[PDB]
């Protein structure tokens, strides 16, 4: 530890102590081997730069160190010395146009006014007091800005190529001393160069001993690191991936290190190289194969977990079933499957491994965390550690498994329960005990400084919250800066924490301020910004989403109490904030979390027209996206039964006070009818005949009045079509508007066309005297705008307006010639070739415009469509 000491003078003496050829060997192999003994985890953030500083400084004595790298100048040229300013300056800071011989020294005299002499010391004392302050202020500026140059430079007409070996190796060390990710590159390259070299000198009998020795050390490094510093954890694993024997590294140690250090790809290639090299005999090597799966599942690569768990190895197909359900985001079904895997008490073909039992334990802990089942997750994360009824949380430190796997979810789930009002003193006493031990303190305040800063803030220790959150920002920057630039998923999954830390930090500011807390005025301003500062609803996963929102919720309740002596403000934010978590859960396809949120807000939403209409709209949106995959028959239950009743509301006809909600409801109930009818088009003969009981009358009131078994779908489609058409009239009474409404008609109409072309329905043909005319005008009205779905769909027109010829009139006569001509270049070769068909009357005006505006665009394919 004296080898990281704060004073550069003591930091140098201990370096110079270990560098001595009796403390630490002089030959390069035994030096490289011995440096593995110069570690304990309290040094880890510095280690790579020290190991490299001990190897390259062995060259400080080498016969080549003062030789030139190249023997001759580039040509005949001449060179000089030089100097660099290097003192006080960055360029952008000054304005443009500006004693036996000497014993005479004992000749002296002294004041006799003690008063005048005291005035001299007062005048000196005030000048000194200013001089002290200004020189401290200058030493502040110059402390940040001081530098040193490690090589000397020449000057001349040409580059001074003949530099000494010294002049590259000194700066190469001086950078590696100073940036960790260069210290990773350098130790790796230099180490792998040393082990390539020993084959020049030493036998198989030595190389057995050496590679067993290095492997024996690297097991220790991965099993004893506590801070998992990403450049160090990755370095050992780059190195051990290059060579046989080293490649045998302890896989549960490797996987824990990579999972915690957030650096999965390098850990994967090691286990991958093992799984081929150690097996070019018990087939499965399950400890390597299942730990490789555990690494891939962390990076979210579910679609390759099929290729691990094919039943030829790891033969417990319950794992394959469980993985399939979470690959579809049925975390509730996946949580059931792992639960029964752990409960199944005897096995044909014999029991699963400790490796798989632990995999099911970790994967199921994670399922309850993608769900929001905090009481189940808190129970589960505490149940496996101790044999008491109230399990002793203090046992968690007993072996590195629990501290790796259980501790992260345990502290999260205790903390989540506190914030939603369950008053248990268990976590606060557990952390108070843990903070007695120096290693346990160093685990907590390094990995959990979010949870800890919330915990002390639940206690009103705003001072300890100020400490742990600031230390959360500093430990974020270290890890983020250290993740190497190519790891886009790793760096992206670090950024997700930066919003959470900033919600805490803003609130700790706000609660401290006397002028802010007194009255409502800046609280409205805070409430405004939080109402539109979300994470990425398309990309950021739900476990960072409910982090932001269960925190926002706590802060609003805490300010509410602090400013007791604004429910009409607070409820509006708390409800609209929670509504955004629902639609993002839907767009993330995570349904059971969305159900669980929906059912909670119903009894709040019932109180008001805007909250009720939004609750109905958000519940019915969620039913469509749910039903979309739900097989043959469960569709008509999951989208007719309740959803169709839910949009007809007497209270939702509140004089259509704003038209956007009417436009939105006018989509929802009609895409509802399409699904109900399209189910019966997938099979007519069974859905009604099997779903025989509760729905049939409300199904009749939801369709045509007739008991004719065929006409029900045409009745359903007729009331769908008019509702879809009503949505257009609301849409034209305001790019979120008409193009989305128009394209849903176009889709439904043209889907009825595809189905229609496969049979003969005359009375559908009769309303279809409108259908494709209402396709073409409204569908194409999109193409003046961005509208790329409709531009992708335009190849249909020219053949429907042949096989149903008459309605071609509705295309050319009005506004095909309104479409910006640059839209129609997309596949112009096809339309400009059709010029012999009568339908070329449609092509005419747009390819006239493209011939006028853009002859270069049409010419080349045109010369051969002109031919023949």
């Amino acid at each position: 530890q004296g080898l990281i000491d704060e004073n550069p003078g003591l930091q140098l003496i201990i370096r110079n102590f270990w560098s001595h050829e009796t403390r630490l060997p002089s030959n390069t192999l035994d030096r490289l081997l011995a440096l593995n003994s110069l570690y304990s985890p309290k040094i880890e953030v510095h280690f790579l730069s020290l190991a490299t500083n001990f190897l390259l400084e062995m060259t400080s004595m080498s016969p080549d160190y003062p030789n030139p790298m190249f023997e001759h100048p580039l040509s005949e040229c001449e060179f000089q010395e030089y100097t660099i300013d290097s003192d006080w300056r960055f360029r952008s800071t000054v304005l443009t146009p500006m004693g036996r011989t000497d014993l005479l020294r004992l000749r002296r005299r002294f004041m006799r006014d003690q008063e005048k002499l005291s005035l001299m010391y007062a005048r000196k004392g005030v000048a000194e007091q200013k001089r002290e302050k200004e020189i401290k202020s200058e030493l502040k500026m110059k402390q940040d800005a001081q530098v040193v140059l490690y090589r000397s430079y020449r000057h001349g007409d040409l580059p001074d190529i003949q530099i000494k070996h010294s002049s590259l190796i000194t700066p190469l060390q001086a950078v590696a001393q100073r940036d960790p990710i260069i210290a990773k590159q350098l130790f790796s390259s230099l180490f792998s160069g040393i082990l390539k070299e020993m084959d020049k000198f030493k036998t198989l009998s030595e190389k057995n001993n050496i590679t067993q020795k290095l492997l024996q050390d690297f097991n220790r490094f991965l099993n004893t690191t506590f801070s998992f510093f990403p450049p160090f954890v990755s370095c050992i694993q780059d190195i051990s991936c290059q060579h046989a024997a080293l490649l045998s590294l302890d896989p549960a140690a490797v996987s824990a290190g990579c999972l915690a250090s957030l650096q999965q790809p390098v850990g994967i290639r090691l286990l991958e190289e093992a799984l081929l090299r150690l097996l070019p005999r018990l087939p499965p090597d399950v400890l390597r194969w299942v730990e490789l799966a555990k690494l891939y599942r962390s990076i979210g690569e579910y679609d390759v977990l099929r290729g691990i768990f094919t039943s030829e190895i790891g033969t417990k197909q319950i794992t394959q079933s469980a993985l399939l359900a979470e690959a579809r985001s049925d975390y509730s079904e996946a949580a059931k499957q792992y639960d029964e895997a752990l409960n199944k008490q005897d096995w044909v073909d014999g029991e699963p491994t400790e490796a798989e039992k632990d995999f099911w334990e970790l994967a199921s802990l994670d399922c309850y965390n993608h769900l929001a089942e905090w009481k189940s997750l808190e129970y589960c994360s505490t149940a496996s550690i101790d044999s008491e009824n109230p399990p002793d949380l203090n046992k968690i430190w007993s072996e590195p498994f629990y501290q790796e796997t259980y501790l992260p979810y345990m502290i999260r789930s205790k903390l989540k329960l506190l914030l939603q009002g369950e008053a248990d003193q268990s976590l606060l006493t557990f952390i108070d005990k843990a903070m007695h031990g120096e290693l346990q303190k160093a685990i907590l305040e390094l990995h959990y400084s979010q949870e800890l800063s919330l915990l002390y803030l639940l206690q009103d220790d705003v001072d300890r919250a100020k400490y742990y959150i600031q230390n959360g920002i500093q430990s974020f920057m270290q890890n983020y800066s250290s993740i190497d630039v190519l790891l886009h998923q790793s760096r992206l999954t670090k950024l997700q924490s930066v919003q959470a830390l900033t919600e805490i930090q803003e609130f700790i500011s706000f609660i401290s301020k006397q002028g802010n807390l007194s009255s409502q005025v800046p609280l409205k301003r805070l409430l405004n910004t939080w109402t539109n500062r979300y994470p990425d609803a398309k990309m950021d996963p739900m476990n960072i989403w409910d982090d932001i929102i269960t925190n926002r919720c706590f802060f609003l309740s805490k300010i509410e109490e602090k400013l007791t002596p604004i429910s009409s403000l607070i409820r509006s934010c708390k409800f609209s904030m929670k509504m955004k978590m629902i639609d993002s859960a839907r767009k993330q396809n995570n349904f059971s979390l969305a159900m669980k949120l929906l059912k909670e807000l119903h009894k709040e939403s019932k109180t008001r027209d805007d909250w009720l209409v939004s609750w109905v709209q958000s519940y019915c949106r969620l039913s469509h996206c749910r039903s979309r995959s739900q097989g043959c028959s469960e569709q008509v239950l999951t989208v007719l039964k309740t959803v169709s009743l839910l949009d007809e509301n007497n209270v939702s006809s509140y004089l259509s006070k704003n038209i956007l909600a009417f436009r939105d409801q006018n989509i929802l109930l009609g895409t509802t009818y399409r699904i109900i009818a399209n189910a019966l088009s997938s099979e007519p003969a069974c859905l009604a005949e099997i779903e025989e009981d509760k729905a049939r009358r409300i199904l009749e009131l939801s369709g045509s009045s007739s008991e004719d078994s065929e006409k029900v779908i045409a009745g359903l489609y007729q009331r769908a079509f008019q509702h879809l058409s009503e949505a257009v009239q609301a849409a034209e009474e305001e790019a979120a508007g008409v193009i989305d409404a128009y394209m849903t008609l176009a889709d439904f109409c043209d889907q009825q066309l595809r189905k229609e072309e496969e049979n003969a329905s005359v009375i559908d043909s009769a309303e279809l005297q409108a259908y494709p005319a209402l396709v073409v005008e409204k569908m194409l009205k999109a193409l003046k705008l961005n509208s790329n779905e409709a531009r992708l769909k335009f190849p249909r027109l020219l053949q429907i307006i042949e096989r149903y010829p008459e309605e071609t009139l509705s295309l050319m006569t009005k506004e095909i010639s309104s479409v910006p001509c640059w839209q129609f270049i997309s596949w112009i070769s096809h339309m400009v070739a059709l010029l012999d068909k009568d339908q070329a009357v449609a092509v005419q005006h747009s390819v006239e415009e493209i011939t006028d505006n853009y002859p270069q665009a049409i010419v080349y394919p045109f010369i051969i469509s002109s031919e023949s």
Binding site: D339, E354, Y368, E373, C380, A383, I385, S387, F401
Partner: peptide, 12 residues
Amino acid sequence: APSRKRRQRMQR
């Protein structure tokens, strides 16, 4: 469905 567990002993 309720979430249940039991203890485990790490064989090392």
